[PDB]
Amino acid sequence: KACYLKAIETQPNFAVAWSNLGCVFNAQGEIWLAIHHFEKAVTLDPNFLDAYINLGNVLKEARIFDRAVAAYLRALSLSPNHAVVHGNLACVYYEQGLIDLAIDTYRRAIELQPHFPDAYCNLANALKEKGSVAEAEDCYNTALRLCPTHADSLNNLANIKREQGNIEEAVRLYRKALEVFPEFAAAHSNLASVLQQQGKLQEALMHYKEAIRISPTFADAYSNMGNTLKEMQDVQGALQCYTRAIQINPAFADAHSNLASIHKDSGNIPEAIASYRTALKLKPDFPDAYCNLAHCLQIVCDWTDYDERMKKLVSIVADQLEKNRLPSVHPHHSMLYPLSHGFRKAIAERHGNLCLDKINVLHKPPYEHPKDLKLSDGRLRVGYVSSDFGNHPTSHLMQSIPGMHNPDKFEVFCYALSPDDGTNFRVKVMAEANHFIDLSQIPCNGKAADRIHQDGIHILVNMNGYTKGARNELFALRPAPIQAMWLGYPGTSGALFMDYIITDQETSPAEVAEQYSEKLAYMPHT
Amino acid sequence: SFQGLMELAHREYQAGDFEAAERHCMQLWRQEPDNTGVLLLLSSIHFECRRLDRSAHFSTLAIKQNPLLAEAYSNLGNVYKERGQLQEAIEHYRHALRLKPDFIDGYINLAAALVAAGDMEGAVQAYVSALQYNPDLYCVRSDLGNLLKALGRLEEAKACYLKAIETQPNFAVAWSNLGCVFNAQGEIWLAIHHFEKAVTLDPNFLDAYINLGNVLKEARIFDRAVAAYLRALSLSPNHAVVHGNLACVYYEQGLIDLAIDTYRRAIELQPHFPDAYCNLANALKEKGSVAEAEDCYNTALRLCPTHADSLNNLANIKREQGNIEEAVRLYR
Amino acid sequence: GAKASVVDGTPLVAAPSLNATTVVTTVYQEPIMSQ
Amino acid sequence: EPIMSQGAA
């Protein structure tokens, strides 16, 4: 730099030395000095193209967009026909917002120089963010063909194919990205996301952990890792993780929503309401958080804005119903609102097919269970499943029945889906149990389902339903012929994997069976 | 404390408080009416706490016991400075720096008195004599710089700034003042660099943030200006001018509703402020809610009959209503 | 007696281009052209 | 700036 300056003072009218000095300063980091120098250079000559290149480059480096646009256009006028400047200019365009012009200028750049993966990748990004997917994967394929190692393109294409659900393919692509780029953070994030979708968590948790290590400020990974970390079972370490994500950037409303959800799980309703209310006011339209807040408010009976709350929640649930994926309102909350029986039927169907899509990953074949009781020797196998075996209303309501069945003609199998707690309810069930099979030891749904299948059971009865503590995925497989709701929350799950509801003449008369999904079962009085 | 050099009142002066120190010096001057610098401490306390004529009286006592101490004259001149008799302060500053020709702080006080009076060059000699006495008082060098800039002799004022800068690189104020110099000359990017350097060396130098955001919106680098202004607001929440600049940036960004909101905040902060009135009414009219645009314009025009921009806008509105005689008069 | 669900986005990626931005002057290779 | 003099004298 000293030699540069000596030349500068030797001939002040000189130009090249100014630009080179500016390069030196840009290398050191004192960017504003560099901008000054480059402006001085172009002032001393409006023809020193590479100076314009450097000036526009460092301008977009510091996000001073419009001046960069002007400099790049001057460069183009001075030389119309090379790609790199077009790529930088178009990137500036896109980050400005003029997405269509970005598409156009990427197209110009690509046609100028063919063998150019980065314009491919960015152009496909802009296309996908514009909605025209059908060529996004095409451009990504062109790029990946040009360079197998271009990790960014791998991540984007795998993201698309995740949208299409080819999770085996997407996972392979993510693995490729990682082995290619062993410090790629977003790739870890997406891989952990799909692994969470894959239900297996230890590796997903580990991937989230490494992604956080490689990128400290990745609050999204906090949010997601907390999501998992409570998803297998609550550790309010997930809560403090949510708080971490909060404080790293308070604009992230989703973390507020999640922590408020955790609070309401704990039962500390007021400040959970406060956090929901916050998160909603941060982003005016956030459906699921708003409906959850409505549920919490109705818990504390705040009937302010009552009718309009009802009508807006009806609106948003209807909207999620004809766009037809996951309803905001939980099915249990649903019927405590004035929603159409068709609406709640649809919501139950949606949660059920969500269960079916979850079990579709393991994808087990059906079973040759039915058609005879000869092997059962006259005692058909009835199996009750419950996460509420113990200290819970159900046991406080059904503890008697099982053990005092008829041992002559039936055989009963309890299934404590929840882990035990040693309460005398469980012991009384244990003695009452003709057969008892704890299932807290089989976290994987398929293994438990096989355990059931050649438990040889025929008729299954569920206690939990769409309630907290329900691995209902079991009945989504339908290991046994006939599966029935009973003594559970009112309302059919409406997903065809089960068989029957239990009712009386008058609670579910024939004219209201239409509001349910499946058939009925009537009994003398109740 | 007791039966010793009870400089504890000096310790409280370092704390800046008076009560225990004040009674302590009372008790001193009825136990050791021997030193008088303690009475100078008293006069000083009365000075900062605005106990003016008591400062004067104790200074006059200092004048009894040793009229040879220039510093009683210094304090008397300070008193005169905040009570008008600046010329007498100046001749006292003569007297003092005749008594102690190599005294610095007298130079500073008399330079302040001079710049109050209006003779620059005498103050120049004050500062320069200070410097030839001490080449390390970088703060007075920056004061030099401010005075010289006020005299528009830019380049050597900038040179003094730089000399201070290299004298103490960790210094902060000099950086901002240098940036002001560059902004005056026109090499804006150098100024932006300097102001960023200043705020980097201290995240508390509010006026630096003001200057930085100001020159940023000067060159239409909006978002950085927004960030700087918000930092300034966090550092000081409650004055209007910054709010007006921030809101103007908002409006020219496009966030017209936020511009309306922030103009409202600015106006409520400082009432007598025509420009926020005019700009707010512009934003309203461009938002369509006319019915209060003329109201705000009227408020501004009431505040200042001469505010031409408001006249033009209101006449434009009333042209829309067709009162062409009125609009023509307003244009005239 | 129930639990809710939380949405997670699918992040995009980006790609920069060259930024070195230097220049040189004497590219010729010159004779003396003397005598 | 008053002195607030500290001196043995």
- For chain A, counts of helices (H) and of strands (E): 25, 5
**Helix, strand or coil for residue B9?**
helix
Residue B193 to residue A66, Cβ atoms within 8 A: no
Q: What is the CATH number of the domain that holds A455?
A: 3.40.50.11380
d(CA B284, CA A470): 57
Q: What is the dihedral of CA A95, A97, A99, A103, to 10 degrees?
A: -30
- For residue C5, the chain A residues in CB contact (below 8 A) are 288, 326
C and B interact (at least 3 Cβ pairs within 8 A): no
Please give the residue of chain A at the shortest CA–CA distance from B195: A32
Is-contact A331 A348, C-beta < 8 A?
yes
Is-contact A210 A218, C-beta < 8 A?
no
A310-348: b or e for each residue (b if 16 or more CB lie within 10 Å)?
eeebbebbeebbeeeeebbbbbbbbbebebeeebbbbbb
In single-letter form, the type of residue at position A246 comes to: I
Residue C4 to residue A54, Cβ atoms within 8 A: no
Strand order, beta sheet including A459-462: A435-436, A410-416, A380-386, A459-462, A482-485
Nearest to B235 by CA among B215, B200, B272, B210: B210
Q: What is the dihedral of CA A166, A168, A174, A179, to 10 degrees?
A: -150
Please give the residue of chain D at the shortest CA–CA distance from B16: D4
Q: Quick one: tokens of A405?
A: 């069945």
Q: What is the resolution of this structure in A?
A: 3.9
**Helix, strand or coil for residue B116?**
helix
Please give the residue of chain D at the shortest CA–CA distance from B41: D4
Nearest to A358 by CA among A160, A165, A161: A165
d(CA B231, CA B235): 6
Q: Which residues 1-35 in chain C show a CB within 8 A of chain A?
A: 1-19, 21-25
* Residue B138 CB contacts under 8 Å (≥ 6 apart), including other chains: B164, B167, B168, B171, B174
The minimal CB distance from A152 to the residues C1, C14, C19 is found for C14
The minimal CB distance from B105 to the residues D1, D7, D9 is found for D1
- Reported in sequence order, the residue ranges of B181-324 that DSSP labels E, i.e. its strands, are none
DSSP A454-518: TTT--EEEES-SSSSS--THHHHH--SSEEEE-SSSSS---SSSS-B----TTTS-TTTGGGSSS
The minimal CB distance from B189 to the residues A32, A63, A66 is found for A32
d(CA B316, CA B320): 6
Q: Which residues of A does the annotation mark as catalytic?
A: 332
DSSP run (H or E) holding A413: strand A410-416
A-interface mutation test, from B182, B212, B221, most A Cβ less than 10 A away? B221
d(CA B159, CA B103): 25
Is-contact A22 A9, C-beta < 8 A?
no
A468: domain range?
360-515
Nearest to A23 by CA among A10, A8, A7, A4: A4
Q: CB-hemisphere CA count at 13 Å for B322?
A: 0
- Nearest-neighbour CA in chain B from A26: distance (Å): 13
Nearest to B21 by CA among B4, B3, B46: B46
Nearest to A290 by CA among A307, A266, A304, A273: A273
Q: What angle do CA A83, A99, A148 make, to 5 degrees?
A: 55
Q: What is the dihedral of CA A502, A506, A509, A515, to 10 degrees?
A: -70
Is-contact A386 A464, C-beta < 8 A?
yes
A203-234: b or e for each residue (b if 16 or more CB lie within 10 Å)?
ebbebbebbbeebeebbbbbbbbbbbbbbeee
Experimentally, the structure was elucidated by: cryo-EM
Please give the residue of chain D at the shortest CA–CA distance from B10: D4
Residue tagged 């970390």 (tokens)? A229
d(CA B276, CA B293): 12
Q: What angle do CA A268, A270, A271 make, to 5 degrees?
A: 80
Q: Which residues 80-99 in chain B show a CB within 8 A of chain D?
A: none
Is-contact A287 A328, C-beta < 8 A?
yes
- For residue A67, the chain B residues in CB contact (below 8 A) are 221
- Nearest-neighbour CA in chain A from B264: distance (Å): 22
Looking at the DSSP bridge assignments, the partners of residue A483 are: A460
Q: Quick one: tokens of A48?
A: 């020193």
Look at phi and psi of residue A392 and say left if phi exceeds 0, alpha if psi is from -120 to 50, else beta. Answer: beta
DSSP B37-81: HHHHHHHHHHHHTT-HHHHHHHHHHHHHH-TT-HHHHHHHHHHHH
Residue B13 to residue D4, Cβ atoms within 8 A: yes
Is-contact B18 B12, C-beta < 8 A?
yes
d(CA A159, CA A174): 9
Is-contact A135 A106, C-beta < 8 A?
no
Q: Quick one: tokens of C1?
A: 């007696």
**Helix, strand or coil for residue B204?**
coil
Residue C15 to residue A20, Cβ atoms within 8 A: no
Nearest to A246 by CA among A205, A238, A209, A231: A238
- For residue C21, the chain A residues in CB contact (below 8 A) are 23, 26, 50, 53-54, 57-58
Q: Quick one: tokens of A90?
A: 């178009």
- For residue B54, the chain D residues in CB contact (below 8 A) are none
Rg (CA), chain C: 30
